[PDB]
Design an enzyme around this catalytic site. Structure first.
Site, short mmCIF file in Angstrom:
data_model
loop_
_atom_site.label_atom_id
_atom_site.label_comp_id
_atom_site.label_asym_id
_atom_site.label_seq_id
_atom_site.Cartn_x
_atom_site.Cartn_y
_atom_site.Cartn_z
N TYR A 42 -7.25 83.62 -38.53
CA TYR A 42 -6.93 82.49 -37.69
C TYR A 42 -5.45 82.21 -37.63
CZ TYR A 42 -5.99 79.56 -41.80
OH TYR A 42 -5.46 79.04 -42.96
N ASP A 53 0.10 77.36 -39.50
CA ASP A 53 -0.69 78.13 -40.47
C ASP A 53 -1.27 79.37 -39.82
OD1 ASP A 53 -1.88 78.71 -42.96
OD2 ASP A 53 -3.65 77.48 -42.53
N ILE A 72 -12.33 72.15 -41.41
CA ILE A 72 -12.33 71.04 -40.45
C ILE A 72 -13.54 71.14 -39.52
CG2 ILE A 72 -9.86 70.43 -40.61
CD1 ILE A 72 -9.62 72.04 -37.75
N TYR A 98 -7.54 66.99 -38.50
CA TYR A 98 -6.90 66.36 -39.65
C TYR A 98 -6.76 64.84 -39.61
CZ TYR A 98 -6.18 71.17 -41.05
OH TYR A 98 -6.37 72.48 -41.42
N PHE A 115 -6.33 76.49 -32.05
CA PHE A 115 -6.52 77.63 -32.94
C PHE A 115 -6.95 78.87 -32.20
CE2 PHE A 115 -7.38 73.94 -35.64
CZ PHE A 115 -6.69 74.24 -36.81
#
Length: 240
Positions: A42, A53, A72, A98, A115
Protein backbone atom coordinates in the site's frame (compact mmCIF):
# COMPACT_ATOMS: atom_id res chain seq x y z
CA UNK A 1 -5.74 6.14 -19.16
CA UNK A 2 -8.72 6.76 -16.81
CA UNK A 3 -9.93 4.14 -14.35
CA UNK A 4 -13.57 3.24 -14.90
CA UNK A 5 -15.87 4.27 -12.03
CA UNK A 6 -18.80 1.95 -11.16
CA UNK A 7 -20.53 1.56 -7.80
CA UNK A 8 -17.79 3.71 -6.28
CA UNK A 9 -19.35 4.12 -2.84
CA UNK A 10 -18.52 0.89 -1.02
CA UNK A 11 -19.40 2.19 2.47
CA UNK A 12 -21.96 -0.02 4.29
CA UNK A 13 -23.84 3.13 5.34
CA UNK A 14 -23.61 4.53 1.79
CA UNK A 15 -22.39 7.89 3.11
CA UNK A 16 -19.62 8.22 0.48
CA UNK A 17 -17.13 7.41 3.28
CA UNK A 18 -15.06 4.95 1.21
CA UNK A 19 -14.92 5.45 -2.55
CA UNK A 20 -13.28 2.77 -4.64
CA UNK A 21 -12.02 2.42 -8.18
CA UNK A 22 -10.11 -0.59 -9.59
CA UNK A 23 -6.71 0.16 -11.08
CA UNK A 24 -5.97 -3.43 -12.16
CA UNK A 25 -8.58 -6.16 -11.95
CA UNK A 26 -7.69 -9.28 -9.99
CA UNK A 27 -8.12 -12.99 -10.75
CA UNK A 28 -10.82 -15.54 -10.06
CA UNK A 29 -13.93 -14.73 -8.05
CA UNK A 30 -13.12 -15.16 -4.32
CA UNK A 31 -12.72 -12.22 -1.95
CA UNK A 32 -11.36 -12.36 1.59
CA UNK A 33 -13.46 -13.49 4.53
CA UNK A 34 -13.56 -12.20 8.13
CA UNK A 35 -10.40 -13.23 9.98
CA UNK A 36 -8.45 -14.22 6.84
CA UNK A 37 -4.83 -13.17 6.95
CA UNK A 38 -4.38 -10.75 4.02
CA UNK A 39 -1.10 -9.78 2.38
CA UNK A 40 -1.00 -6.34 0.79
CA UNK A 41 1.24 -3.54 -0.44
CA UNK A 42 0.00 0.00 0.00
CA UNK A 43 0.75 3.67 -0.32
CA UNK A 44 -1.16 6.52 1.31
CA UNK A 45 -1.27 10.20 0.35
CA UNK A 46 -2.88 13.34 1.70
CA UNK A 47 -5.08 15.37 -0.70
CA UNK A 48 -2.18 17.79 -1.19
CA UNK A 49 -0.09 14.89 -2.56
CA UNK A 50 2.01 14.37 0.59
CA UNK A 51 2.94 10.65 0.64
CA UNK A 52 2.64 9.79 4.36
CA UNK A 53 3.29 6.01 4.34
CA UNK A 54 4.07 3.05 2.09
CA UNK A 55 4.95 -0.61 2.54
CA UNK A 56 6.68 -0.80 -0.88
CA UNK A 57 10.21 -0.25 0.42
CA UNK A 58 9.78 -2.81 3.21
CA UNK A 59 11.15 -6.37 3.13
CA UNK A 60 7.81 -8.13 2.81
CA UNK A 61 4.10 -7.42 2.41
CA UNK A 62 2.11 -5.84 5.16
CA UNK A 63 -0.21 -8.46 6.67
CA UNK A 64 -3.13 -8.46 9.13
CA UNK A 65 -6.42 -10.22 10.00
CA UNK A 66 -9.24 -8.77 7.95
CA UNK A 67 -12.42 -7.41 9.55
CA UNK A 68 -11.06 -7.23 13.10
CA UNK A 69 -10.30 -3.49 13.30
CA UNK A 70 -6.55 -4.07 13.11
CA UNK A 71 -6.45 -1.38 10.42
CA UNK A 72 -8.52 1.71 9.61
CA UNK A 73 -12.18 1.09 8.76
CA UNK A 74 -11.66 2.06 5.11
CA UNK A 75 -9.16 -0.78 4.73
CA UNK A 76 -11.35 -3.44 6.38
CA UNK A 77 -14.15 -2.27 4.03
CA UNK A 78 -12.04 -1.90 0.86
CA UNK A 79 -9.87 -5.00 1.09
CA UNK A 80 -12.95 -7.18 1.62
CA UNK A 81 -14.10 -6.08 -1.86
CA UNK A 82 -10.84 -7.05 -3.61
CA UNK A 83 -9.94 -10.13 -5.64
CA UNK A 84 -6.48 -11.69 -5.36
CA UNK A 85 -4.02 -9.73 -7.56
CA UNK A 86 -6.28 -6.65 -7.70
CA UNK A 87 -4.95 -3.13 -7.32
CA UNK A 88 -7.49 -0.54 -6.19
CA UNK A 89 -7.53 3.19 -5.43
CA UNK A 90 -9.62 4.38 -2.47
CA UNK A 91 -10.59 7.83 -1.19
CA UNK A 92 -11.66 7.76 2.44
CA UNK A 93 -13.30 10.34 4.69
CA UNK A 94 -11.75 10.83 8.17
CA UNK A 95 -14.55 8.87 9.93
CA UNK A 96 -13.13 5.82 8.07
CA UNK A 97 -9.48 6.66 8.63
CA UNK A 98 -7.72 8.65 11.37
CA UNK A 99 -10.55 10.89 12.62
CA UNK A 100 -9.98 14.00 14.77
CA UNK A 101 -6.71 12.50 15.95
CA UNK A 102 -4.34 11.81 13.08
CA UNK A 103 -1.19 9.82 12.58
CA UNK A 104 2.10 11.45 13.58
CA UNK A 105 3.75 13.35 12.11
CA UNK A 106 2.25 13.61 8.62
CA UNK A 107 -1.57 13.23 8.92
CA UNK A 108 -3.64 16.09 10.40
CA UNK A 109 -7.05 16.10 12.15
CA UNK A 110 -10.11 15.44 9.97
CA UNK A 111 -8.11 14.38 6.88
CA UNK A 112 -9.52 12.78 3.71
CA UNK A 113 -6.93 10.30 2.43
CA UNK A 114 -6.19 8.38 -0.71
CA UNK A 115 -4.66 4.88 -0.81
CA UNK A 116 -3.35 2.55 -3.47
CA UNK A 117 -3.71 -1.06 -2.26
CA UNK A 118 -2.65 -4.28 -3.91
CA UNK A 119 -4.01 -7.55 -2.58
CA UNK A 120 -1.44 -10.29 -3.11
CA UNK A 121 -2.94 -13.21 -1.21
CA UNK A 122 -5.36 -14.12 1.56
CA UNK A 123 -5.33 -17.21 3.78
CA UNK A 124 -8.22 -18.66 5.80
CA UNK A 125 -7.93 -19.81 9.43
CA UNK A 126 -10.25 -22.81 9.22
CA UNK A 127 -8.35 -25.67 7.56
CA UNK A 128 -11.16 -28.24 7.67
CA UNK A 129 -13.05 -29.55 4.60
CA UNK A 130 -16.38 -29.10 6.33
CA UNK A 131 -15.35 -25.70 7.70
CA UNK A 132 -16.30 -26.70 11.26
CA UNK A 133 -13.59 -24.88 13.24
CA UNK A 134 -11.80 -28.13 14.16
CA UNK A 135 -8.43 -26.99 12.76
CA UNK A 136 -7.65 -23.27 13.26
CA UNK A 137 -4.46 -21.75 11.86
CA UNK A 138 -2.59 -18.68 13.06
CA UNK A 139 0.06 -18.04 10.39
CA UNK A 140 3.40 -16.89 11.82
CA UNK A 141 5.40 -16.79 8.60
CA UNK A 142 3.88 -17.11 5.11
CA UNK A 143 5.48 -19.83 2.98
CA UNK A 144 6.79 -19.76 -0.57
CA UNK A 145 5.20 -21.09 -3.77
CA UNK A 146 1.58 -22.07 -4.42
CA UNK A 147 2.18 -25.84 -4.19
CA UNK A 148 0.76 -27.65 -1.16
CA UNK A 149 1.40 -31.27 -0.05
CA UNK A 150 -1.25 -33.76 -1.16
CA UNK A 151 -2.13 -37.23 0.13
CA UNK A 152 1.00 -39.37 -0.22
CA UNK A 153 3.38 -36.43 -0.33
CA UNK A 154 6.68 -36.77 1.52
CA UNK A 155 7.01 -33.82 3.88
CA UNK A 156 9.70 -32.60 6.24
CA UNK A 157 8.33 -30.82 9.29
CA UNK A 158 9.39 -29.43 12.66
CA UNK A 159 6.59 -29.72 15.21
CA UNK A 160 5.85 -28.84 18.85
CA UNK A 161 2.59 -30.08 20.39
CA UNK A 162 1.19 -28.45 23.52
CA UNK A 163 -1.65 -29.42 25.81
CA UNK A 164 -2.65 -26.56 28.11
CA UNK A 165 0.69 -24.85 27.33
CA UNK A 166 2.66 -27.95 28.43
CA UNK A 167 4.97 -29.38 25.77
CA UNK A 168 4.32 -33.09 25.02
CA UNK A 169 5.98 -33.65 21.63
CA UNK A 170 8.88 -31.92 19.93
CA UNK A 171 10.32 -33.49 16.79
CA UNK A 172 11.58 -33.00 13.29
CA UNK A 173 10.27 -35.69 10.92
CA UNK A 174 10.19 -36.69 7.31
CA UNK A 175 7.09 -38.72 6.57
CA UNK A 176 4.39 -39.55 4.04
CA UNK A 177 1.06 -37.70 4.44
CA UNK A 178 -1.48 -40.43 5.31
CA UNK A 179 1.05 -42.42 7.39
CA UNK A 180 1.36 -39.90 10.26
CA UNK A 181 -0.87 -41.91 12.62
CA UNK A 182 1.96 -44.45 13.02
CA UNK A 183 4.25 -41.62 14.17
CA UNK A 184 1.71 -40.46 16.80
CA UNK A 185 0.65 -37.44 14.74
CA UNK A 186 -3.06 -36.63 14.99
CA UNK A 187 -5.28 -36.52 11.88
CA UNK A 188 -5.66 -32.73 12.16
CA UNK A 189 -1.90 -32.15 11.95
CA UNK A 190 -1.74 -34.11 8.70
CA UNK A 191 -4.73 -32.22 7.30
CA UNK A 192 -3.18 -28.89 8.39
CA UNK A 193 0.09 -29.73 6.59
CA UNK A 194 -1.88 -30.28 3.34
CA UNK A 195 -3.05 -26.67 3.59
CA UNK A 196 0.46 -25.28 4.11
CA UNK A 197 3.15 -24.05 1.69
CA UNK A 198 6.89 -24.56 1.70
CA UNK A 199 8.55 -22.65 4.56
CA UNK A 200 5.24 -21.81 6.23
CA UNK A 201 5.36 -21.51 10.03
CA UNK A 202 1.92 -21.75 11.59
CA UNK A 203 0.27 -22.35 14.93
CA UNK A 204 -2.59 -24.82 14.57
CA UNK A 205 -5.31 -25.43 17.14
CA UNK A 206 -6.99 -28.82 17.07
CA UNK A 207 -10.36 -29.70 18.53
CA UNK A 208 -10.50 -33.24 20.07
CA UNK A 209 -12.15 -34.91 17.04
CA UNK A 210 -9.17 -33.73 14.91
CA UNK A 211 -6.74 -34.67 17.65
CA UNK A 212 -6.60 -37.80 19.82
CA UNK A 213 -10.36 -37.85 20.38
CA UNK A 214 -12.27 -39.65 23.10
CA UNK A 215 -9.44 -41.93 24.24
CA UNK A 216 -6.45 -39.56 24.26
CA UNK A 217 -2.76 -40.35 23.97
CA UNK A 218 -1.30 -42.07 27.02
CA UNK A 219 2.33 -41.83 25.86
CA UNK A 220 1.97 -38.01 25.76
CA UNK A 221 -0.19 -37.85 28.93
CA UNK A 222 -3.05 -36.47 26.80
CA UNK A 223 -6.47 -37.19 28.31
CA UNK A 224 -9.80 -37.79 26.49
CA UNK A 225 -11.47 -34.75 24.80
CA UNK A 226 -8.28 -32.71 24.71
CA UNK A 227 -7.85 -29.59 22.57
CA UNK A 228 -4.25 -29.33 21.30
CA UNK A 229 -1.95 -26.62 19.95
CA UNK A 230 0.91 -27.31 17.57
CA UNK A 231 3.64 -25.04 16.30
CA UNK A 232 4.22 -26.40 12.78
CA UNK A 233 7.03 -25.62 10.30
CA UNK A 234 6.64 -27.14 6.85
CA UNK A 235 10.23 -27.25 5.74
CA UNK A 236 9.84 -28.88 2.35
CA UNK A 237 7.92 -31.57 0.52
CA UNK A 238 7.79 -33.71 -2.61
CA UNK A 239 4.32 -34.26 -4.00
CA UNK A 240 2.98 -37.78 -4.82
Amino acid sequence: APLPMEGVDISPKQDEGVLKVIKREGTGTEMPMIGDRVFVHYTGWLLDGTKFDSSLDRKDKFSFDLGKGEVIKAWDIAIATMKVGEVCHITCKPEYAYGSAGSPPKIPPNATLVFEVELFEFKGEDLTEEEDGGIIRRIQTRGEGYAKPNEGAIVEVALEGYYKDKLFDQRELRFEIGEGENLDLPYGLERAIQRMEKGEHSIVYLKPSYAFGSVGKEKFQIPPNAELKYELHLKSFEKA
